[PDB]
C-alpha cells in the first residue's frame, strides 16, 4: 500500500543551564528507526531497528554530520525568533521542524511536506506545489520574503522528489519482513454492570498494525460513546477500545463494527452472554 | 536520508 518516511526535530532553550536541548527521530510508516540526542554520551546517530543496522560506517558518519548541522541552524533560529517577538531572555522556548515524503502502491511520489513551528504554533510551511510558502504572521511574512527571494524551495523540491523517495524505497526493500506486514486486530467484547438500571459494553481491538483503525457503535443500524486514543502496545503493535452505556436488558440491540486494512471484510461484533 | 543543511529563518 502507501508508505511514508518522516523526520522530527525539536530544540528547547535552557537559560542559565548551558546549551539548548536537541532531539531528532526518524520514522518509516509507524516504525522508528533512528534517533539523535544531544544529552547522550555517544553524540552519534543511533539505530533503533534491526534492518537499519546493516549499513556501513559512511552512512552513520554522514548522518551524524548532517544532524549536527541541523542543530547548529536551530540554535541560531532560537535567538533570531526570540528577537522577532520582543521576548526576554528569561524563559525557555521551543522550535520544531518536520519533513518527509509519501509514495503510492506503485512506490511513486505522491506528496512532500516541510513545516516549522515556534512555541507550539505554526510559523511557516511549504505549499503542496513545492514552490511557495504559507506564513500566517507578520514575522513569518518577513521570513517569507527572504526565503522567496533566495529560492529555498528549489533545494527542498529536488530533495523530496529525489533522495527521499529513493531511500524510502531502499528502506522498504531492506526491512521487508517487518515494514510490509499487516496484523489483523484480535477483537473481543466485555460487559460491566452500571448499577440497577444500566450497563457498559466495551469493544476491544488488540495488537494490530498499522495504527489506522476505525471503531464505531451501531444500535439497530444507526450510528451513535467513549473513544480512547490509539496507544502503542510497546512492541510494534497498537491497541484501542470503545465503550457505550446501555439500559439494562437492551444489550442485544447494539453492535460494534471494526474496519482495518489487515481485514478483507469489516468485522461485526455482537454481545454473546 | 536526512537533509544536508537547513536555512535559518
Amino acid at each position: 500500500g502507501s508508505h511514508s518516511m518522516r523526520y522530527f526535530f525539536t530544540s528547547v532553550s535552557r537559560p542559565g543551564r548551558g546549551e539548548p536541548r536537541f532531539i531528532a527521530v526518524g520514522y518509516v510508516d509507524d516504525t522508528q528507526f533512528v534517533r539523535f540526542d544531544s544529552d547522550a554520551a555517544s553524540q552519534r546517530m543511533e539505530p533503533r531497528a534491526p534492518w537499519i543496522e546493516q549499513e556501513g560506517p559512511e552512512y552513520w558518519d554522514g548522518e551524524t554530520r548532517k544532524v549536527k548541522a541541523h542543530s547548529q541552524t536551530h540554535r541560531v533560529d532560537l535567538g533570531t525568533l526570540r528577537g522577532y517577538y520582543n521576548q526576554s531572555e528569561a524563559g525557555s522556548h521551543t522550535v520544531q521542524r518536520m519533513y518527509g515524503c509519501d509514495v503510492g502502491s506503485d512506490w511513486r511520489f505522491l506528496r512532500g511536506y516541510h513545516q516549522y513551528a515556534y512555541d507550539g504554533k505554526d510559523y511557516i510551511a511549504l505549499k503542496e506545489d513545492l514552490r511557495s510558502w504559507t506564513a500566517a504572521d507578520m514575522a513569518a511574512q518577513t521570513t517569507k520574503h527572504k526565503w522567496e527571494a533566495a529560492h529555498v524551495a528549489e533545494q527542498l523540491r529536488a530533495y523530496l522528489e529525489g533522495t527521499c523517495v529513493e531511500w524510502l524505497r531502499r528502506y522498504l526493500e531492506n526491512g521487508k519482513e517487518t515494514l510490509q506486514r499487516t496484523d489483523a486486530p484480535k477483537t473481543h467484547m466485555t460487559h460491566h454492570a452500571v448499577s440497577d438500571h444500566e450497563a457498559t459494553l466495551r469493544c476491544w481491538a488488540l495488537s494490530f498494525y498499522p495504527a489506522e483503525i476505525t471503531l464505531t457503535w451501531q444500535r439497530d443500524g444507526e450510528d451513535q460513546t467513549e473513544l480512547v486514543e490509539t496507544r502503542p502496545a510497546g512492541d510494534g503493535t497498537f491497541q484501542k477500545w470503545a465503550a457505550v452505556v446501555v439500559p439494562s436488558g437492551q444489550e442485544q440491540r447494539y453492535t460494534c463494527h471494526v474496519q482495518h486494512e489487515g481485514l478483507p471484510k469489516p468485522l461485526t461484533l455482537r454481545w454473546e452472554p | 536520508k536526512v537533509l544536508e543543511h537547513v536555512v535559518r529563518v
Epitope: 529560492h151 528549489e154 533545494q155 529536488a158 | 544536508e4 543543511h5
Partner: antibody, heavy 118, light 109 residues
C-alpha cells in the same frame, strides 16, 4: 572530509579563453550553491559568479557579464567557469566557495592562478 | 548593491592587547554579517557567522556583536597567530555579494 580542488589556470593572451574546474568530494554536491571569488595581486576579495543548487538561477558581476559562463554537473561533482574574451584586468587568483551550513561560505578551494599578458 | 566600509585600513598592536574592527553597511542588514581571516598566501577562513556566532574550531577569544548597520569584531588577547587580514561580508541579498576592503593587523615595536 569535505574539500574542493581547482585546476585549469595558466598563462593566456588577451582575447584568449580558459576553462576552470572545481572538483568536490565528501558531501552531496547537488544541495549547495557555489560561487567563484577572485583576488587581484595585492588587492581584496571580489565576487565573480554564482549558480544555484539545481542550476536554474545564475548571476554574474557587472565587470564580467557577457564574457564568463558558469555551469555545474551534479552527477560527477564538478563546477566549471568558461572565460572568453579575457582582458589584462582579469589577472587574479580564483577560488570556488561552497555555501555554509548556516550562513556564509565555510568551504573554500586552494586557488588557481590566471595570468593574462601579451 | 550594498557597500561595506571597514575601519581602519591598518592597525598595529602588541601581543596581549585588545583589538576592535568595525564594518559599516550602506543600508540595514538585520543580522547577515560574516567575518573572514586570510593569512598571506592562502585561502580565507570563516570565523564568525550570523554576526555573533563562533565557527567550530575557533578560539573563544574572538567575538562579534552588532546589528542593523554597525558591527564589530573584537579580540580579547592577541596571539602570534592572529596577525592577518580580516574581511566582512553581507548575506542579505544577491546579486551582488560584497566584501569589505580589508583590514591588515601588524605587530608594534
Amino acid at each position: 572530509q569535505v574539500q574542493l580542488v581547482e585546476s585549469g589556470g595558466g598563462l593566456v593572451k588577451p582575447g584568449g579563453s580558459l576553462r576552470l574546474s572545481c572538483a568536490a568530494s565528501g558531501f552531496t554536491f547537488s544541495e549547495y550553491y557555489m560561487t567563484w571569488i577572485r583576488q587581484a595581486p595585492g588587492q581584496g576579495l571580489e565576487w565573480v559568479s554564482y549558480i544555484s543548487s539545481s542550476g536554474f538561477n545564475i548571476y554574474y558581476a557587472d565587470s564580467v557579464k557577457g564574457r564568463f559562463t558558469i555551469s555545474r554537473d551534479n552527477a560527477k561533482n564538478s563546477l566549471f567557469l568558461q572565460m572568453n574574451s579575457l582582458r589584462v584586468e582579469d589577472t587574479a587568483v580564483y577560488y570556488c566557495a561552497r555555501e555554509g551550513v548556516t550562513d556564509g561560505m565555510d568551504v573554500w578551494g586552494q586557488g588557481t592562478t590566471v595570468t593574462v599578458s601579451s | 548593491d550594498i557597500q561595506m566600509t571597514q575601519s581602519p585600513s591598518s592597525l598595529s598592536a602588541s601581543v596581549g592587547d585588545r583589538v576592535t574592527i568595525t564594518c559599516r553597511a550602506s543600508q540595514s542588514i538585520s543580522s547577515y554579517l560574516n567575518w573572514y581571516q586570510q593569512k598571506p598566501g592562502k585561502a580565507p577562513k570563516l570565523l564568525i557567522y550570523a554576526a555573533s556566532s563562533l565557527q567550530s574550531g575557533v578560539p573563544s577569544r574572538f567575538s562579534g556583536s552588532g546589528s542593523g548597520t554597525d558591527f564589530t569584531l573584537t579580540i580579547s588577547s592577541l596571539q602570534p597567530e592572529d596577525f592577518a587580514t580580516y574581511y566582512c561580508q553581507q548575506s542579505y541579498s544577491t546579486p551582488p555579494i560584497t566584501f569589505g576592503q580589508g583590514t591588515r593587523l601588524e605587530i608594534k615595536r
